[PDB]
């Protein structure tokens, strides 16, 4: 309710209690939804005073009020977070992590999560100021359940921001130091802790195979497959993103997901009413069908081919594009028998209907798949049989009409098939 000018008068007074009320009043201003006047605050020069109040051990209320005020400034645009870091806030908040007052160390956790959240450079600067050790020491209890729920969720969220962002990814040793506490939060029974722990693991598996390995080595894949089955969307979404990332790795890393039971969840995932879940599940499936023949066989055995035919036939267009990738990866690496099977499941007609989409990328993918499938057919003498099938469902009209397509890759490929097999 105070004007900024009054808060400035209060803060510049020489009177700690007057500075306290004025800081509280700033906190309340900055605590309202409809555009808190952050820039006004910054422009009055208040950040350096808030930061020096962070160090007032004798006046824990002004530590709390200023922590909160700065939390909210640091929650704004990059320029606003930078004004907080530029005021010296980072080591001051890290020292508040050891405060005996739980509400004050929690406010310091939160503020550091906002600063780390702005991007790679500030995340790495938080880390270089030594935030990780006193953060992890707040969770060094025998049973996470004895911590206050809100307090535990804030910690988990700030730790997930320390795992987030990519160019560069977090330092390898900081990831190693954080991982065991993260594996433990991933077994915790609060849905928001679980969601954010899963997000963190999704960020850490989003990168080169060496990064995936450090996570998989910690034996989290079975817990991730279990979370894949949760009823809470906010948990399924990151658990599936993490699983999808792990199967972009090596064949051995892909195999840990299959052995953990993940494929049995895909009938639901591939039909999930949330379109982003269907899209990410089909993308994951495309990377599994880019696997070894024995892994492709597991996809067969789990009955997932008819589910791929399903999403190819009807899904959001972005999912259908993933289904087309899953098919052309399957047909490039599968045995003749796995490829025949795919056709017996009814792949050909939805594949041909997608030759009508005005998306140049999907067209090449589908044409590569057809080529692969003809390839298997030749190996069996069936080119003819397959060729009529393609014709009867109207697929020859599509391949033919694609030679009037001013993408050279497209109508080169079409022409190629239009003679070679027709």
């Amino acid at each position: 309710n105070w004007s900024v000018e009054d808060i400035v008068k209060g803060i510049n007074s020489n009177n700690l209690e007057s500075q306290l009320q004025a800081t509280q009043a700033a906190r309340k201003l900055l605590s309202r939804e409809k555009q808190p006047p952050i820039d006004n605050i910054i422009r009055a020069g208040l950040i350096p005073k808030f930061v020096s109040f962070l160090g007032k051990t004798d006046c824990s209320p002004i530590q709390f009020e200023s922590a909160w005020a700065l939390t909210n400034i640091a929650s704004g645009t990059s320029e606003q977070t930078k004004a907080v870091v530029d005021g010296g806030a980072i080591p001051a908040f890290i020292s508040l992590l050891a405060s005996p007052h739980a509400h004050i160390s929690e406010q310091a956790v939160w503020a550091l999560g906002n600063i780390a959240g702005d991007g790679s450079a500030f995340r790495d600067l938080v880390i270089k100021h030594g935030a990780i050790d006193p953060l992890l020491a707040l969770l060094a209890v025998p049973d996470l359940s004895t911590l206050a729920c809100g307090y535990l969720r804030n910690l988990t969220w700030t730790l997930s921001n320390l795992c987030r962002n990519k160019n560069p990814a977090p330092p390898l040793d900081a990831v190693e130091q954080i991982l065991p506490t993260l594996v433990r939060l991933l077994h915790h029974n609060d849905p928001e802790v679980l969601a954010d722990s899963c997000w963190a693991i999704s960020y850490l598996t989003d990168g080169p195979n060496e990064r995936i390995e450090m996570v998989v080595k910690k034996g989290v894949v079975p817990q991730l497959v279990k979370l894949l089955g949760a009823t809470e969307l906010p948990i399924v979404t990151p658990a599936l993103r993490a699983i999808g990332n792990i199967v972009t790795g090596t064949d051995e890393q892909t195999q840990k997901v299959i052995d953990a039971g993940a494929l049995a969840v895909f009938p639901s995932l591939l039909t999930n009413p949330k379109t982003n879940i269907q899209k990410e599940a089909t993308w994951t499936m495309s990377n599994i069908t880019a696997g070894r023949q024995d892994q492709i066989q597991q996809v067969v055995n789990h009955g997932l081919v008819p589910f791929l035919v399903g999403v190819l036939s009807k899904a959001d267009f972005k999912t259908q594009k993933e289904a087309a990738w899953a098919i052309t990866n399957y047909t490039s690496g599968g045995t003749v028998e796995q490829i025949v099977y795919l056709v017996h499941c009814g792949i050909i007609e939805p594949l041909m209907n997608l030759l009508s989409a005005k998306d140049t990328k999907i067209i090449q993918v589908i044409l590569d798949a057809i080529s692969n499938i003809f390839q298997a057919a030749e190996k069996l003498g069936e080119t003819e049989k397959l060729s009529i099938m393609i014709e009867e469902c109207g697929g020859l009209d599509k391949i033919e009409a694609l030679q009037r397509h001013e993408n050279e890759s497209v109508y080169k490929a079409s022409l190629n098939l239009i003679e070679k097999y027709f």
């Binding site: 605590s31 909210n72 977070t81 702005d118 921001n161 790795g249």
Partner: peptide, 14 residues
Amino acid sequence: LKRKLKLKRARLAD
């Protein structure tokens, strides 16, 4: 052929 939650949060009133 493999193919590879909220950044910042204000504390509201309270």
